[PDB]
């Protein structure tokens, strides 16, 4: 596996370091590596492609050694270097593209294409150069069972599910008490609404609870807590649960009090934060359980007596909301991020040729459905594809 | 044998490659094989004869 | 240009790795390259400043050579190295600041200030340390008529425009049906509004369309799509183009059905998505076209039955909202983003010495005025100034 | 302090460079560096922990030197190196955790934990490989009192503050007029609300002025400007300053008029922008001033005249909103940023071993209180702990 | 680029100087050049075409030498030269035609076809014979960024615009006072008309002025100026401004009084001419402003006494005219003229092979649409294609 990354690294270093005029005592080791790789890669035929619309390509390597006697690189040396580098770049690009799309439900941590299978034998092992990037070194560390790490920025970890539940309802949908929440991307906005402002509930305090189970394990995540829902405050016409009727919504926002946010790991309390909005920090968690309160104000002004009448009619309802966002996180598995272009890369390469798909990857790499059901084989295949994409991004932009 | 002619010719310790004259106060170079030696690495900025 | 980057990288290496106690064998290549650079740059005169309010300065390069004898580096070695380094880095920074403050309407790929003009000679091409930096690599690729690329996090590429267009209008402004949108930053909010909820439109369904083109070619873009846009979900009082008319807009967000997005390029269909949300992606697109239907619910409750009367007197208008945010994307031209400090540094340097407005760049480096009339020559000049700014960013941290 | 970073860098290089197949010349400098490190570190015993729940462990380096091979390595040499690498990474992690949890009011530039002080002697200065990272460069440059800074993307600098101001007030609370703002995280939202629609003010225009200070100056900052308030536009029941009675809020958003954004330095005008919105650039500032006017529309259609009469009672109040968001900036002093997991690592190490609130940091590592009471001693301590965390975040992903 | 012109010039001299019977003394340098060209070009391989309707042509350079004897040339030598001359002519023509039909958005100066890019290598520099044509000299001087210059015989710089304006108007279209003008090629024919015969206007003088901005700056312009316009001097029926009906126009020519022609540059009045006709010279100009006055005849004869009644009913109108024609021009940028035919050849090959339309050139290589928005990128493309066309015209008449 690492041989392809080594090829990418040596090609990039040769392309950005073999420039006429440089001192020869600066790229001696790189030139030695290049020459040894050329010696080791001569005389072997390779067949690439043959699945879907991806064209079938053939590759033959037969080249002489470079020069090692000059002390100042000139036009001829760089010209020959670029001439062979273009061919090597084409080889790397096509091999990566051919090996990328292929998938399997068995041993998704092993080479999948003919090129990688032939290039991971004993003889071709003398070309490994270094592991300087992050994804490849994570691959190496996970290969021999070491702790895994990954740095993401606002990653799409929570799935997309716009569902709501009601605690007290009516057959005509005029007096309601329930919760709404939009969970998408890395944003969690849960809102609780009470039509009656807790005039029938004890102690005038109504409690809304919600649980959001993450599909994997995170670590060292920063959370910004804005104590006002940005969404569940505009007038709405929302379809009901049974799908036969739709009801009206005219919310009015009241600030929440006694806000409790908790982060639990393995079904146990780890971190507790109370009534602290702004920036909060957690070390390791798997399930986010939020519990907040809505309290009817004791005394009111002439502008408030028309808001919450104790009488039968109800048109404006007390509503609260909490905004939970992750600005950075570190995980042990691989997930699509927002700072790089891994998922975009794999989706583009897969859709360019339209490889037929089986029960291995979700249709069209739909990220939401992928996060929905997460089997370890899918995780391993996704990790391998992302690593191959990272190798690809080193050479061809 | 021609591509590496200059390296073979210059590395000889019996002949030089020319003399530079400027009639202006210029400092000398410091090398880890000759100590304080009067050497001009390049010849740019003068008339070549 | 590339010579300047080589000098910058060598200067950074000398500033950083030359510390007391390190083995001399670890910087033998570095010390040889530094000595070669000193030899090449010695005995030449350079001038800077002269236009605007940049202080004119004169540099003369008379310097010694660092020893190549000490087994372990010592303090005086470091002090002499830094004595040379301070002057070299001052020269580099002044050259960059002089290059940033001059532009040419034609042939922007070529040097403009005297320093870079002198450095273009073949004599100074003896210092080519490396080209590891991504921007310098892109510059080299552009210098040889070959494909380039960039990676950005949330790049502001959409033009700044705030306007609304009506399909049905009346002078009294009490029965309207049109589209309202705001293309700001990297986020798109499009909302189509109707005052009758399709009581007279055919089949009780109203069709809405919206087109926003682009001036460059985005590629491999991760796009987040969410419904019920934010900004257009509260009452507004907005003036019109008549210059004497003001109308009121009372929104009630219905539910959007049959959301149709169309990523077009050169007047052709490349990516099409239907009835999908969350996080999506397109391979290569040039313009974004959105289509959606405003549907009147055939089944209602009394709380809704009062919301939508069957007569002209209207108490609440209806609309739907869609949000489109570009998280990550890959472009082929230099673009100002929210995750870098290049354009900001260029503008800061421009305003620091108060250079008068040039013939090409709009006054004050106003980004919107630059993007509304984007031209390839302006693109090339922007690439040049961004590369030199990135070279500057490697010195002063 | 430099020795720990040297250890981290060399450990990463040794782990990611010594793989089977590479040529011998590719690891010569690294092999010699490891040899020197083993020579210097053997014999000198060290002790870690001693405070809190962190176990008190012992270390006595008893490792021999490494071998070599002319053609290529063998896996036995690889594992012999790997065992020593494991011991060293364990030692580095333990000493970093020890260094993380000590702080005092006295000068924090000097090391605190005994292990680092014993390491920082002259006797172990030969093992200093390089300083190529960002935080280490900042530390070294701040040691010599030069220009220093850090790269920030979406800087979490402004403290959590949710307060409002009044210009005219009544005990009945039905004729309010003033400014309400919420500066949370990197986002500034200022809304000026009026109930009288400026029918009594001179020139029918109401002026709102808002000012927010900044503890540490910023340089080459980029700020996007949006002439709206996508958050403070909902019906609200806001508690009054009395603490027992609440008043009613009902906003309608008009387009702001004469938006003036100001950037000042110690009460000196620096940057001014009139009627411009979008990604703008400010050279340098340390305080933010906003001034805008609410103008009663010259012409009122019935949908407008229904809400803003010459009469006293109001139910649909008017408000104009402004949005301020900072994307990226470079600050002289270290600030908790969102693009890196430094704060999360610091708080995780602080909270794992149950270390109570010290004499400097607020309890629970809450950022708002710490940034509200910023002091140079706290600045130095924060810089030290951030650098230690950055060193630690290189070995245990 | 220059190598192509060298090939063209050498081939032309070879075909038009080597005629049977000529002395050796007039062909010595040409013989040496031919021998050098064949001894340098032999053994290579070239590919061209393959885009649109040009099949992939493969060329092999393998020819003998030319003897340095036979002081007087015989016919056998003539035919031996002629064979290679024909082959080189065919190769040059096909390469030029392949190059002429490829365009790029950026870096238009550099070649695009693979043939010219290969020819821009290092070893092929040995044939750079000379530079004598205008285009090659201007190109090679632009490569060093010196002052550019071209000579034109009656160029076509003014974009087509048959636009008219009305200072005073009414929906009756029987009382007008305005100006009409035509911008067709090198002819400017402005005219100012009145219906009131200036009886209402004070001082019986109706001021007329007109502004035409040139897209490029010209130098050493000889201008032929005539006081009579021969286009807006006949009865006409013209569509209205917005366009709802057709108004009538019955003109009578009157002598212009106080004719003022000014050539401006960036707001500076450089050259002036007052009450002068015939020919004028402008050293440097970019904008043209003309002013002339209609004067009511202070004295009248019976016929003109009945021509203009003192009341509103007007049977005849009054109009003055001016004529401006650019005789010769010198510009800093390439243009299309009425004497040279390079644009004609470019369009000829374009429509001969029907290459698809790129986004940088309007369809058909039309001149009006191209000059409507003259961009620097399109300017560079025009310069490159025109230089290549000039090279071609030296070989195939």
Coordinates of C-alpha atoms in Angstrom, one line a residue, chain C residues 15 72 78 89 102-103 203 252 280 300:
Chain C
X15 CA 16.8 31.5 10.7
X72 CA 29.7 21.8 16.8
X78 CA 24.8 32.1 15.5
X89 CA 15.1 39.4 5.4
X102 CA 2.8 48.3 -8.7
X103 CA 0.6 46.8 -11.4
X203 CA -53.2 22.9 -10.6
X252 CA -45.0 32.0 6.7
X280 CA -24.2 16.8 -1.6
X300 CA -56.1 21.9 6.8

